[model samples]
Target: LSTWQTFRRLWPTIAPFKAGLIVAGVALILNAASDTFMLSLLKPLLDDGFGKTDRSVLVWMPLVVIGLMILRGITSYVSSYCISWVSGKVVMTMRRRLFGHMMGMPVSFFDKQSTGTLLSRITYDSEQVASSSSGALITVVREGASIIGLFIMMFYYSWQLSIILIVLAPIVSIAIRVVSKRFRNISKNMQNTMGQVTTSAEQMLKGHKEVLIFGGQEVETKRFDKVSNRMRLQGMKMVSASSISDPIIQLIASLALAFVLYAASFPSVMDSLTAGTITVVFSSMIALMRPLKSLTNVNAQFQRGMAACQTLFTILDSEQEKDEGKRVIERATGDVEFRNVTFTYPGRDVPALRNINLKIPAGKTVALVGRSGSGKSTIASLITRFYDIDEGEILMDGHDLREYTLASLRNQVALVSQNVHLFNDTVANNIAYARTEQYSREQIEEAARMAYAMDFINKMDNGLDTVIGENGVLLSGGQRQRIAIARALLRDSPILILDEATSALDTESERAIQAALDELQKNRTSLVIAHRLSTIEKADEIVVVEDGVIVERGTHNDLLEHRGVYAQLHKMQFG
Candidate 1:
C-alpha cells in the first residue's frame, strides 16, 4: 500500500485522540515561536543593549532570555507528554484488537500461521507503529512549525538571504526520497527474519530436553545463527542508509549557510543590512538546519511504521470463521448422523473422507477403529463441526449441524482428544475452565474423582489448587490426560468424544479410567476413536474404517464371527 493509504487506514485508530493531538500541535507551535522569538531578540541585544551604554537593559536582557527558555521548556514538556499519551493508546488498542481478532479467526487460520510470527506482530511489530504515529507526527509538527517560524523571521530581517534556504529545500527533499525508497522493503525483510529467529529460539527452548538427549546442541546453534545472521544483514542495510543520509543532508545545509553569508556581503546587500539585522538573520538560518535535518531523517522511521502497518492490516482483514448460524440450541438429544459426507482439507486435492454414512442413537456408545490416516478421527472432528463437510450434511437430533449457532452447538458436545492442552493455572481452574461459576468447587472435585485424577491431584502439595505449569508440563503425560478427562466430565455435555483419550495411560490406569468412562457414558452419546482394540470390545457398535470408507461394522463378537478387518485388528492387539 502507498504510505498515504496506510495513514488513511490508521486514521480511525488515531481519530479518537484528536483532542490530544491538537493539544500537542498547539504546544509545538508555541515551542517553535519561542525559538524564533529568541533569534529575533538577538537583534535588540546586539544593536541596543550591547552597543548603547544603557546598564538597565543588561539587567532585563538576561531575564527575557531566561523567561523565553522557561516558556519553551514548558511547551516542550506538554507536547512530549501529549504525544506520548496518544502513542501509548495506539499500541494498547492495536494489541487488544489483534489478539481479539485472532481469537475469532477459524481454526484453519491458525494452521497456516506460525505462533512466533503472530506473536511478533503483536509484540514487536506494534512497537514499530509508534514511529509512524507519535514519533513521526512530533517530528513533522514541531519541525514543520520551526521551519515556518524561522522563515518568517528570515523574511522579517531581509528577504534577499531567505532565498538560499528555499533553493536548498528541494534538494534535501529529493535526497530523502531516494534514501527512503528501499527502506520499506528492508524493514519488511528485517521483520520476517526476526520472526524466524524468534520461532527458532522458541522451538529450541521448548524442546531442549530432546536436543540434549539427542546431542543436538551444535545443530540447534547453527540453525539459530543462520536466521540471526539474516536479521543482522537486514538491520545493517537500514543503518547504512541512515548513516549516509545524515552527513549528506548536513553538507547541503552548510553550503546553504555559506551562500547566504556570501550573498549578504554584496555592496547593495550590506548597504541595506545592519550588524544587528545580520546577526538575527544568520541565527535564524542556522536554527533552520536542525528542524530541516530532523524532517529528512524521520522518513526512515515513517517507512518502517508503514511496513508494520501493512502486516497488521493483512491479518485484521483476512476472513474470520463464519459464525452466522441463527439457530440457538440450548441442548441436543445426542443423536448424530453423517449423511453421505465427503470432506477435503484445505490445500489438498483428495478428500479425507469420501461419501461416508454413519449414525449413533441417543445414549449409545459407538467406536471407530482404523489405521492412521484412515479418516477415523475426521469423523469425530466433523461431528463437532470443526470443518464443514464438502458434499453432505452432519446432523444432531435430525437437525443439520450448520443450522445451530456455533457456540450453542459446541456447548452440547464435550471433547477429549489425544493431544490435550492445559493452561497455566490451578488444577481446579483448568478442570472448571469456562464453567467456573456454574461448577462449584465440590462439583469440580467430584468430576476429578470420576476421571481417577484425584489420587495424583491430592498427592500434590496444594491439591486441587495446585498451579500447573504451562500445558501442565510439571505433570506426567498420563496425569495431564486425566486432568483433561476430568475437564470433559465437568462439562457433562450430551455427547462425549474420546479420541485416544487414554492413550497416554499405563495399563492399570487405563483400566481404571475406562471404568470411570463407562459409568460417565451411561446416559450420553459417546464416540470413541481408538487404535487399542481392547478398549472398544464392549462398545454398542464397532465400525472399522479404511481409506476413507467403512469396510466392516459390528459388535466385537459379531465382527469376530465374520472374521473381517475388525477381527484382524482385534487379533493384532489381543495376540
Candidate 2:
C-alpha cells in the first residue's frame, strides 16, 4: 500500500489491455528462457563440445544454436508488438478522458487557465504519461525477468562468484536508489518547463498577426526566448541526472568482475573450477549489464511520465460544472426574473451586479441601457447560468434557474452578442450549427432570408456550401454578425438576448441587423443590452444600470417626462 501511493499507478488504464498483456507476458518469459538456456549451453560448449570434440556434440550444437535464435527472434517480435500496442491504446484512452473532462468543466475553470497550458496537457503531457505507464511497464517486466534468470544461472555455475555479487549488492542498490530520486526531481522540473515552452509558443503563434501589425515582435520574442532558455536549462539538468548513473553502475560492475578474477587466481579458490565454469560466470555477469542498463535508463522516463500524469490528473480531478437539477425543460415559458440578486465575479473584490431586481414578462421586451461595464451583460450571463450569483435567485418560468438542467436552460436562450463567432464551416452549416440535421435546406434558406445573409452568401462561389475560413475570416464584420443573427433566428428560442447586436456594424448594416433583430425579437421575451437610448426607444421597459446599481427605470417617454439621467444622455450635452 505504501509503494502503491508512490507509484503513478497506471494499472487501471492498462487493465483493459490485460488480454494483450498476458500474451506479451508469456512471450517475455519465453524470451528470457531462451537467454537462460543459451547461457546454460555455454558450459557444455566449452567443456564437451570444444574440448572433447565428440562428433554429435560438434554438429548438433550448431543446430541447437540455430534453434535458440529462432525462439529468440519469435518471442522478441511478439513481445515488442504487444507492448507497443498496449502503450498506444493507453495514450488514446488518457487523451480522450482529458479532452472529455475539459468539456464538462465549468466556465470558471477556463477563466483561471490558459489555452496553451491546456493544449500542452492534452497533446504533449498525456503522451508522456502513457510512455511512463505503459512504456516503462514493459521495460520493467522484460528486463526484470531476464535479470532474474541470468542471476539464477550465475549462482548455479559458481556459488562463490554469486556470493561476491551478493556482498557488493548494497553499493549498487544505494546508488540506483539515489539516482532514481534525482531522476524524478529533474524530470518533474522538465515537465513544468515543457508546459511553459508549449504555452509561450502557442500564445505567440495564435496572435502572430496582431504582433506583426503592432510591431511587437521584439517584445514577444524576448519573453518567448526566456521560456525557451529555461526549458533548455531544465533539459540539460535532466540529461545531467541521466548521464551520472550509467557510468557509476558500469564502474561498479567492473569492480565485481575484477574481484571475481582475483578470486580465480587464488590456488585455494581454483580447487574445484573447470575452464567452462569460469567462462560461464564471466559470460553471465556481462549479460547482466544489458538488463541493468535498461532497468536504470527506464527510471528517467518513468519519472518523467509520472510528473506529466500528476499534471493531467490535477485537471481531471477538478470538479465539473454543477448540474444539481433533476428537471430538464423542453421549452421554457420565457418568464425570466432576477430577484434580490448580487454577484461578484470569481477573483474579484467588486460586485458586477448588486441587488438587481428585474423581470421580463413572457412575450415582452426589457431593454438594459447602461454605460460600458455597468453589469448589463452580467444579467444575460446569469440567465444562461454562466456564473451563479453570490446571493439571490435567477428564475426562469417562475422557478429558480438552478431547477432546470444546465443544457435545457441554455437551449431556451438565443443570444446574439457583440462578438459574432462563426465556425470554419459552410455558410449553411455555420448558421444552423448546433442542430443542423433537424432543419432541412429550405428551413435553413428561410433563416438566411430573415437574417439578410442570403445577399452576401449568394455572391460566394458555392453559396451555402462554401467553406468559410477560420472564424469566417473571409467574411466582413457585418457579414459575420448576419450569420450569427441568422443562427439565433434559427434557434427560435423563447428568450432572445441581443447584446450590442448592432454595435459594430456600419449604419446601413446596423439598419439591416435591426430589421433582422426586429423579426427575431417578435413576441419573444427579449433582453436588449445596449449603450445608447436611440436603439431601445421601442422597448416596453428600459432600465438604467450604473456602477453595479440600477438607478433609473421607465419607458422612453416616461423617462423623457422626468429630466433625470435618461434625458441628459439623449441631450448629448453632458459627458
Candidate 3:
C-alpha cells in the first residue's frame, strides 16, 4: 500500500463529517482571505494617515486592523475545531477497524507477531495518521487560500510584480521537493524506531518478574536504551533538516525582496501609485511568500503522512484466507475425519501436516500422544479451520468442513491450551468472554460451578466483580488454570481441544481440574494433546503421532497391551 492508498482508506471515516468539513473549509479560506486582504487596507492607513497626516484615519486604522484580526481569529477557531473533530473521529474508526482486522486474522498470523507491535500499529500509528490529517488539511486550506488571494491582490496593484513572483515560484518549489525527499526518508525511519521502542518497552514490562529475579535490569536497560537512542537520533535529524532548509529559503526570499524594495524607490514604479495601493501591494508580497514557505514545509509533512498511510492500509487490505463452502453447522457431532490432508505454513519448505486419513466416531474422547514438533496441535487447528489445508479435507458430520462458514464451523469448538489467556476483568466476566453477548448471570455461575472455580470466586471480596490484575496476575497458576476451564465450560461448544491445558497446574490442582475435565467430557467430542499419560489415560482411543504421521491408535488398555508408541509414552510418564 502506498501512502496515498492509506489516506484513501481514511476517506470513509471522514466522509460522514463532510458537512462539517465543508463549513470548516470555507471558514479556513475566509480566514486566509482576511489575512490576504488585510494588507490592502494598510495602503489606505499609510496614505491617509502617514502620507496625508490624517489623525482620524490613523486612530481608526489600527481598530480596523484589529477588527479584521478578530474576524480572522474567529474563522480560524471554527476551522481548527472542525478539522480536529474530523481527525479524532477518523482515528477512532481506524483504531476499531485495525483491531477488528487483527481479530479476524488467522492463528498463524498471530504466532509470528508480537502482541505489542500489533497494538502499536493500532494505537500510536493510528494517532499519527490523525495528526497528519488535521495538520495537512488545515495547512492546505490556509496556505492555499492565502496564496491565491495574495496573488490576485498583487496582480491588481502591478501586473509586473505578479509576473515576477510567478517566475520565482518554481525555484522555491524545486527546493521544497528536494528537502521533502529527505524528510520522507527520515520520517519512515522514525516510525520504524518507534515500533522498536514500543516493542522493547512491552517486553520489559511483561517480563518484569523475570527481570527482577534474574537481576537483569542493567541488561534490559541497555537494550531499551539502544532502541530509544536510535529513535531520538532519527527524530533529531528530521528536525535539523527542516531548520536548515527553512532559513535557506528565507534568505533567498529576502534577496528577492531587496529588488521589490529597491524598485519602489524609483519614481516610474512609485509614481501614480496611491498610498493605499502601494501599501496593499507591499503587504501582498509578504502574504504571497507565506505559502511559499508553507508549501515547502507541507511537502515534507505530506510525505510522512503518506508513508504512515501506506503502513496502515497494508494491514487493512490484507487478503483474508477463504473457506468458500457454505455449510451451516450449529452443533458438530463428535465424529471427525481427516482425509488426504497436506499443509504448509507461509514461507515454509516442508508441509506441517502431510497426507493422512483418520476417523473417530461421535462422543469419543481421543488422546494424541506425540513428542514436541510432532504436528499434534496442527491437527486440532485444522478442525477449527484456523488454517486451510493444501490438499484433501477435514469432514465433520460427513460433510467437508469448508462447506460451512468460518464463524459457524468454529462455533462448535472451545480450545484450552497451555498458554491460556485471561483478561484483566472479573472472574465472571473473564468466564463469559467467549459468549458474553448471550450469557445470563445464572448460566455463568453454573459454568463456574462445573469447573469447580466457584469456591474461590465466592471467597473473593467482590465475588464476580473482583478485578483480576493484568493477565490474571492476582491469581495463582492453579486459580488461573481453573478459571480458563470455567471460561471454556461457559462456551458450551460441542468440540473441545485440550492442548496440555492442565500442564501448568500442580499435582492437586491438576487432579482437581482433571475431574472437572472428565465431568465436562461426558457428552462432548474431545481431542486431547498431552505428554503426561495420567491426564488422558481414560480416553476411548489413543492416537500416537510421530514426525507429523499417526502411528498407533487404540483404547488406553489396548495401547498398553500393544506395547507400542503409546505404551512407551505411558511408561515414561508413569514409570
Candidate 4:
C-alpha cells in the first residue's frame, strides 16, 4: 500500500490520545515562539542599556542572560516530556492491536512465513513507528513555530528586508523537493533491504552451531554478507542523497544574508535601519531562516520517516479476519461429520482433499494412517478449519463448522502437531498459554501430570518456572512435544488432534507417554495421525488415507484383517 493510505489507517490508533498529542504540539510551539521572539527583545535591551553606558546595567546583563537560559530550559523540558508521553501511549496501543491482529490472520499466512521475521516486525518495526512519528511531530511543531515567530519579528524590523530573503525560499524549496523525492524511493528500498538483513542474521544466529557441525560456515557467511552488503549499499545511497540537501539550503541562506548586509551598509537604507535595528533585523532573519533551513532538511527526513510509517502501518492495516459466528457456540459435544468434503489451497489447481466423508460420534478416537504425502494430516487440519473446504462442509454437533466462530471452534479442539512451538518463557507459562484464563497453578500442574511432562519438568532446577528459551530449544524434541501435549490437556477441549505427536520420541519415551495420552484421550473425540501403527491398536476405528482420498475405513482389527491399504502401510512401516 502507498504510505498515505497506511498512515490514514494507523490514525485510528492515535485517535484515543489526541488530547495529549495536541498538548504536546502546543507546548512545542510555545517553546519555539519564546526562543524566536525573545531574541527580538535583545534589540531594545541593547539600545536601552547602552543609552548611557551605565556600569550597573552591564552588571545586570549576565543575570538577564541566565534568566532567559532558565526559561528556555523549562519550556524545552515540557516540550520533550509532553511529546514523549503522547508517543509512548499511542505506540502502546498500536503494539497491542498489531499483536492481536497478527494472531488472527489465516493459519496459512504463518505457514510460509518465518517466526523471526514476524517477530522483527512486531519489535523493530513498531519501535520505528514510535521513534519516527514523535521525532517528526516535534520537528513540525518546533520548527513551524520558530518560522512563524521569527518571520513576525523580521517583518516588524523591516518588511522590505523580509521580502528580500523570501525570494530565496523557492530555491531552497526546489532543492528539498528534488532530494526528498529521491530519498523516499531509496528509503523504501533501504527498509526492504533491512528486512532481508534481519532475516539473514536471524537464520545465521539460530543455525550457528549447525553451520560449524556441517563445515558450512564459509557458505553461510557469504550468504549473510551478501544481504548485509545490499543493505549497506542502500544506506550509503540514502546518505549521499541526504547530504546534498543541507548544503543547498546553507548556500541560499549565505547569499541572502550577504545581500541584506550590503543593503544595510548603503547610506539610503542605513538611515531607515539603525545600528541596533540592523542587528535585530539580522538576528531575526537568521532565526527565521534557521528554522526555514531546518524545515528544508526536515521535509526530507519527514518523507523518509513517513515512508517507513507507510510500510509499518500497511501491515497494521490488513483486514482483521472476520469472525463469522459472533455468538459463542458453547460446549462442543465432539460430534463431527464430514460430507462430500473437497479442499483446495489458494492458487492451486489440485485438491488437498476430495469428496472425503467421515463421521465420529460424540466420543471416539479415530486413527488416520497413510504414507508421508498422504492426506492423513489434512483431515486433522480440516477438523480445525485452518483452511475452509473448497467444495464441501464440515459439521460439528449437526451444525456447519462455518456457522461457528473460529475461536469457538478452535477452543473445542486441542491440537498437538509434530511441529511444536513453545514461548521463551517459564515452562509453566508455555503450558498455560491457552488456559491462562481458566487454569490455575494447581490445575496446570495436574494437566502436566496427565501429559507425562511433570516428571521431566520437576527434574529441572527451577521446576515449572524454568525458562524454556526461544522456541523451547533448551528442551529435547520429545520434551517439547510433551509440553505441547500438556498445553492441550490444560485447555481440556472435547476434541483432540495428535498429528505425529510422538514421531520424534525414542521408543521408551513414546511408551511412557502413550499411557498418559490414552488417559487424556478417554471420553473425548480424538484424531490421531501416525506412522507407528502399534500406538493406535485400541483406536475405535481406523481410516486408510492416500492421495487426498480415504480408501478404507473400519475398526482396527477389521482393517488389519482386510489386509488393505492400512494393513499394507502398517506392514511396510512396522513389519
Best by TM-score: 1
What C-alpha lDDT values do all the predictions have? 0.79, 0.78, 0.76, 0.75
Report the CA-based lDDT of candidate 1 relative to the real structure: 0.79
Encode model 4's per-residue lDDT on 1-575: one tens digit a residue. 35566568768777777877787777777777668756876876677667766777667877877877787788788778877887788767878888887877777766666878878876777777678767767887888888877778888887766676676657766876776677677677766656766776787789866777889878888887887887688678768766766676677657756866786677766566655676777667656656766667765656676776666666776766656876566688988988999887776567778888888887887787776767766777888888777788888898888877888887878888657867777877778775566668998898888788888888887778889877656897778778888887777689888877347545465776777777777778888886555557877888777888888888888887898877676666632
Residue 455, candidate 1: alpha-carbon lDDT: 84
Q: Arrange candidates by TM-score, highest first: which order?
A: 1, 3, 2, 4
TM-score of model 1 (CA atoms): 0.74
- The TM-score, computed over Cα atoms with residue i paired to residue i, of candidate 3 is 0.73
Task: Report clash pairs, candidate 1.
Answer: none
Native RMSD of candidate 1 (Å):
13.6
What stretches of model 3 exceed 4 Å from their correct place?
A: 1-13, 41-54, 94-105, 111-117, 124-130, 155-267, 273-287, 296-314, 355-357, 424-426, 434-439, 467-470, 473-476, 505-508, 555-575
lDDT (Cα, tens digit) per residue for candidate 1, span 1-575: 48789888878888999998899899999998898898888888888887787988778988999999999999999998988888889889988998888897787777777888878888888887885656887888888988888888889787865665567667767866665665556665656655765676677679876888889889888877886787677678757755665676677657766876787678857787888887777677667767878899887888888887888888887977678689888778888888888898897677878877788999888888777678877787888888878898887888788878888888888887657777788888888778678779998888888889888889888768988897656887778778878887888688988877336444455776666666778788888886555557778988888878888877878888998777676667622
By lDDT rank, best first, the candidates go 1, 2, 3, 4
Higher-scoring candidate on TM-score, 2 or 3: 3
Model 2 C-alpha lDDT per residue in residues 1-575, reported as the tens digit of each score: 22244363667677778888898889989898898888889888888886684778878888998999999999989988987888788889878887888898788888887888778878888777766766687788888888888888888777876776666766767876786787777777766666766776787789977887889889888988887887788678778767776777677767766876787788775786788987887778768867888889886777777777777788888889888897888888878888899898898687878888887899988887656677877787887888888899887777888877888888888877657776778887877777879998898889898889898888888768888888666887778778888888788799887777346434465667777777777777878875534457778888888877899898888877987877776665222
**How would you encode candidate 3's per-residue C-alpha lDDT over 344-444 as one tens digit per residue?**
87757778788778887878877787777788878888888888888988888888887778888777788876577767777767777756768899988
Q: State the displacement of the C-alpha of residue 465, model 2, in Å, after optimal TM-score superposition.
A: 3.8
Question: All candidates' TM-scores?
Answer: 0.74, 0.72, 0.73, 0.70
Inter-residue clash pairs, candidate 4: none
| Candidate 1 Cα errors over 4 Å, as ranges | 1-12, 37-74, 164-267, 276-280, 296-311, 424-426, 461-463, 473-476, 505-511, 558-575
